[PDB]
C-alpha cells in the first residue's frame, strides 16, 4: 500500500494515486521522453491496489495531449481495469474535458470502446 | 474395414460350425482371432492417445494465435488513436500559423510574413549574391472610395486589388498587405531590369480592375515606389528606400511608379 | 509381446503341416496371420506420417511464438519513433503559441511577454552569472504627432518604429512594447560596453525613419535609458533604474541616451 | 455435405460431378462418426457404375486417426484403379509450407493412380 | 547402465542397473524412433530376464509423438508381462498440475496395466 | 504495372517505377485511412520482390510521419530486410534537409534493424 505522487512538468502529467480514497488522478499533457520511467510505477500501483483487496478503484482523468506511448500506457491501465471488472471488482473512470474542444470527447470514446466498466466522458460544467 | 468385418464374420461361422469342433485347428483359430481383436484394440488405443496429445498441442497453439491477434489489434488501435491526436494537433498548428501570417481581409501575407521573409532574403543576398527587388504600392484617393461607397466597398476594392496583383506575379514572388491600403511586393532573386515588366503587368492589372458596387463600377490607380536591395544593407533600409520612392511617386502626380537608383 | 510370439510360432508350425492345407480353418489361420503383418506395416506408416504432421505443427507454433515477441517489440519501437515525431510537432506548437501573444498593433512582444522574459533572464543571471542589459525607449513628443496628425498616424509611426528597431537587433536580443509609446529592449548575456553600438544602431533606425502621412514625411526621435542587471534584484528594480535613466535623457533634451 | 467447423474439415461429395472435396484442419473428436460416412459414400460411388472419381484435397493438419481414414480412402481408390476404374487425386498446399508437400508425397508412395501435389499462392 | 542424454526433441533417459530404475524426462519428437527406443526396450528386456529384482519407472515425459506412444505401449506391455509372472514392477507418471490433460492421457496409458501405476501432480 | 499515387496536402507522393526498380516517396504523411494508402504500396513491393530478382531501391523524401505511417514504413522495411537476407540486392536512401536536426536520428532509428544498404543523406 502506498500513496503515489508524481509532480507534473510541462511535458509530463501530474499523477496522484490516493490509496484510502481508491482514486488515481492524472492531469495535463503527456510527452514523456522515457515513457517506462513515468508509467511503470503507475501500472504497478494499479496492480498492487487491485491485488490488495476489493475496495473500488476510480480513475479521475484530466488529460490533455497524449503521445503514442502514453496512449499505449493508458490502454494497459484500462486492460487491468477491464480484467478487474470482469471478475466482480467495482472500478470506474471519469474523463473530464473542456466543452469547447469536442474532438477530445471522440478520442475518449475511442478509449472507452472496449471498456465495460462505468466510463464517463464529462465536460467541465 | 469392410474386409476385417467380412473376415471376422467368416471366422465366426467357421468356429460355430459343428463339423469343425474337435479339429486340431479349431481351437487355434479361436485363440488367434481373439489375439487379433486385442491387437486391433491396441492399435486404436494408440491412435486415440495420439489424438489426445495433438488436441492438447492444438489448444495451446490456438491460445497463442489469439494472443497474436490481440496484439495486432492493439497496435492498430494505438496507431489510430495516436493518429487522431496528431490530426488535432495539426489543425491547431495550421489555424495558429494562418492567424499569425495571413491577412484576414485579403488572404495575402501579412506584415509579419513579409518581414520574416525579408530577413531571410537579405541573408540569401549576402551569401549567394542574389538580390531581390521591393515594390511598395499605395492606393490613390482611397478615401474617396470609402467616403462615397462605404468602407465595405473599399474592402471589396482591396480584395480585388489583391487578387489582381497575385494573378500577375511569378510563383515565388510575394505580395503582402503592408498597411490599410498599402501593399509590399517582394520579388526574390530578381534584378530591376527583370522586375520592370512584371511590375508593369501588376500595374496594368490594378488599372483595368472594375469593382462593381451596385449601380457603379469603381476603378482606381496606385502609386508605387520600387528599389533593388543593395548588399551590405539591412532589409529595413531597403524598405525605407522603396517607401521614399513611393513618396516621390505620390508628390509627382499619382498613377506613377518611380525607381530609386544609386549615384556612385 | 511374448505370448503373441509363442502363439504365432505355434500357428505357423500348424500352417506348415501339409495335412491341413486347403482346409477352411487353415485358410482362415493364414488370412489372420497375413492381416496381422499388414496391420503392423500399416501402423509403421501411419506413425511416420503422423510424427511428421506434428513435427510441422511444433515448428509452426515455435514460429508463431517468435512472431509474437517480435510483435511486442515492434509496438514499442513504433511508439518510440512516433513520440519523437510528435516532439517536433510540439516544438512547433509552443513556438506558435508564444508567437500569438503579440501586441496587435506593432506585432512586438507585449508587456506580459516582456515580464516573462525578464523573470527568465533574472534566473539565468544567477545560474550562469552573466547579466543582461535593459533599455527603456520612448518616442519624443509623440503627443504632438497624435495631436497634429491623428492617432492613426501615431499608430503608424509606432508600427514602423517597431520594424526599424527589430531590424537592428542581434540574434538573442529582444524588443517589446512596454506600453503606449514606450518600448523595452533586452540584451541577454551582454554588458554596457558591448551594448553601446547596438543601441546607437537602434536609435539610428528610429532617427532615419521617414513615415508618410499623405504627401508629407514625418521625422521622429527616441530618448532611451540604459542600465545593467544587478543580480539578485528583481527585474522590477532593474526596470526602474532604466526608467529613471530615460527620464534623465528627456530632462537633458531630446534624442538622448543616458546610462545608469 | 458435411459443414466444417474450426476442428473439423468441410467435406462435399458431388454425385453428378463425381468429386470428393475436403478442406481445412482435421482434429475430430469422434473420427469414425465423421469419416465413416465419407468411406461409405466413396464405396457406394465405386460400386454404382464406372464413372470417374476425383479427390480435390486442401487439408491442412490431419491427426493420427484422420491419417488412418485417409489411407483407408486411398486404399479404396487404389483397388479401383487396379480394376481399370479412372480415379485421380490432387492435393493443393500453400507454397510457403513445404512440409505439407512431402507429407503428401508420403501419402502417395503406395498409390499408382494419378496423384498430383499442386502448389498455390 | 543405460544413459542417453536429452535433446531439444528427444527425452533424457537413465536406466540405472543398481537401483533398478528407468527414468525419462522431456518431450519426445524423435526423428528415428527405432534407434532411440530400441536401446530402451532392449535394456528393459535384459533387466527383466536377469534376476527377479524389482523394476520401477519414473517418467517425467511431456509431449509424445505417435511412434513414441507406440514405444511406451511396448514398454508397458513388457512390464505387465513381468507383473503377471510375479515380478514386482511399477511406474509413476509425473505431471504439472496446471496441465489437466496430461493426467487423462496418462490414465489412458494405465487402462490395461494391472501393476502399480501412480499418476503424480507437482 | 507501375504505381502512381499523387501526393495531396496530407498524403505523400508515391511512384513505383517497375523497370527502373525504384520506389520513391515524398512529403508529409497524415493519412486518414492508412490501409487504403499503404496497402497498395506493400502489395507493389511484394509483387516486385516476387516477380523476379531485379534489385529494388527505395528513395525517400519524406517529411512528417504519423503513427500508422511509421508502422507501414516498418512493414516495408521488413519486406526489404527479408529479401536482403535471401540474397536479393535491395537498398534505401533517406533524404533529409540539413536544417532538421532531429530527422536524422529518426531515420537512424528506422535503420537500426536493417542489414541492407540504408543511407541517410543531408541534402540542402
Ligand atoms: N475600407 C478600408 N479602408 C481603409 C482601410 N484601412 C485604411 N483605410 C482608409 O484608408 C484611407 C486611406 O487614406 P490615405 O491618406 O491614403 C488617403 P488617400 O487614399 O486619399 O491617399 P493618397 O491618394 O494616397 O493620398 C484612410 O482614410 C484609411 O482609414 C481598410 O482596411 N479598409
Ligand atoms: Mg492612399
Author numbering:
A (entry chain D): 1 to 125
B (entry chain A): 1 to 264
C (entry chain B): 1 to 260
D (entry chain E): 5 to 125
E (entry chain F): 3 to 124
F (entry chain C): 2 to 125
What does the paper say about this structure?
To investigate the regulation of SiaD by SiaC, we determined the crystal structure of full-length SiaD in complex with SiaC. In the asymmetric crystallographic unit, two SiaD and four SiaC molecules bind together, adopting a unique extensive conformation: two SiaD molecules (SiaD-A and SiaD-B) form a parallel coiled-coil via their stalk helices, and their dimeric stalks are stabilized by the binding of two pairs of SiaC molecules (SiaC-C/D, SiaC-E/F), each at distinct locations (proximal or distal to the SiaD DGC domain) along the dimeric stalk. In this complex, each the SiaD monomer consists of an N-terminal domain, a C-terminal DGC domain, and a long extended coiled-coil-like helical stalk domain linking the N- and C-terminal domains. The stalk and DGC domains of SiaD monomers bind each other in parallel, with a central C2 axis of symmetry, to form a dimer that covers one-third of the SiaD protein surface (4460 Å2 of 15,159 Å2). Two DGC domains in the complex are oriented anti-parallel, with their active sites facing each other. Moreover, a non-hydrolyzable GTP analog GpCpp molecule was observed to bind in the active site of SiaD-A. However, there was only one GpCpp molecule observed in one of the SiaD A-sites, leaving the other A-site empty. In addition, the side chain of the key residue T68ʹ in the N-terminal portion of the SiaC α2ʹ helix inserts into a space between the parallel SiaD stalk helices, forming strong hydrogen bonds with the side chains of SiaD residues S82 and Q86. Triple mutagenesis of N67ʹ, T68ʹ, and S69ʹ to alanine or phosphorylation of T68ʹ significantly prevents the binding of SiaC to SiaD.
